[PDB]
Amino acid sequence: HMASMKKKGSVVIVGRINLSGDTAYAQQTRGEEGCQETSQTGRDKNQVEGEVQIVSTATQTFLATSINGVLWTVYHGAGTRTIASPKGPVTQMYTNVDKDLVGWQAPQGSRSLTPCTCGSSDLYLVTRHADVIPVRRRGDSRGSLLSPRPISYLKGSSGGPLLCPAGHAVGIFRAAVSTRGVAKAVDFIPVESLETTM
Numbered sequence: 325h326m327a328s329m330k331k332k333g334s335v336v337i338v339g340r341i342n343l344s345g346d347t348a349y350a351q352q353t354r355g356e357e358g359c360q361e362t363s364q365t366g367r368d369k370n371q372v373e374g375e376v377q378i379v380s381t382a383t384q385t386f387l388a389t390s391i392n393g394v395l396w397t398v399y400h401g402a403g404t405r406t407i408a409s410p411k412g413p414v415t416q417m418y419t420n421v422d423k424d425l426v427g428w429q430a431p432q433g434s435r436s437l438t439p440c441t442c443g444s445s446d447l448y449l450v451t452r453h454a455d456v457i458p459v460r461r462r463g464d465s466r467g468s469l470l471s472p473r474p475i476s477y478l479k480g481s482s483g484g485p486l487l488c489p490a491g492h493a494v495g496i497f498r499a500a501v502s503t504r505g506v507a508k509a510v511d512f513i514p515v516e517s518l519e520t521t522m
């Protein structure tokens with residue numbers, strides 16, 4: 325079926341989590357129609373701002389987080405896809421299925437988080453709805469929610485950051501641990517695992 329073989333589209337930035345001020349809030353920067361066309365062309369002329377992007381493919385939506393000049397997300401969201409940019413599709417510079425991790429060069433205009441060196445266990449998870457959820461670190465890749473809630477509230481937030489009290493990146497949200505649909509804990513990619521990948 326060589327003549328008909330299709331190509332998957334690019335990941336597309338469709339919004340961001342604004343952490344600029346005192347109040348965190350989600351912003352949409354591209355609607356579903358323009359996302360569809362930008363995914364096909366890989367050409368995204370929109371201005372990018374901030375640390376946490378909301379990203380989409382044709383079938384999934386999740387988050388992506390800039391840390392040290394790399395926009396990081398999960399492999400279960402992005403696969404091996406390019407990301408759209410002003411000059412066309414950009415190929416991944418990191419791919420690690422064993423960690424559920426991918427990364428591209430951070431887009432012009434983004435701001436990057438700094439990797440945490442505090443060694444603190446009082447963390448904060450940022451979701452696609454701009455909820456800032458306290459999480460106690462429980463291991464290298466696990467943290468417990470101080471206030472559990474249904475997994476529905478976390479769906480679509482893979483690729484988002486866990487931050488320390490000082491706003492540094494401690495990890496990338498990967499998976500939720502639940503009992504009877506209630507998220508009690510989170511699984512995340514520690515920033516050290518990104519820093520060695522780099």
Ligand SMILES: COc1ccc2nc(C)c(O[C@@H]3C[C@H]4C(=O)N[C@]5(C(=O)NS(=O)(=O)C6(C)CC6)C[C@H]5/C=C\CCCCC[C@H](NC(=O)OC5CCC5)C(=O)N4C3)nc2c1
Pocket residue numbers: 384385386387399400401421422423424475476478479480481482497498499500501511
């Ligand atoms: C393909 O190659 C791959 C390589 C490595 C890899 N490695 C993984 C750990 C993995 O896990 C998958 C996807 C995540 C997920 O759903 N990620 C969140 C999310 O939001 N995704 S998302 O909606 O943005 C989406 C799907 C658009 C991208 C953050 C969750 C939110 C809610 C949970 C919903 C029920 C699901 C509860 C699961 N629990 C869990 O597995 O827990 C155990 C891990 C150790 C304990 C869970 O979380 N997953 C199951 N897939 C892969 C795939």
Ligand SMILES: [Zn+2]
Pocket residue numbers: 439440441442443488489490491492
């Ligand atoms: Zn820190």
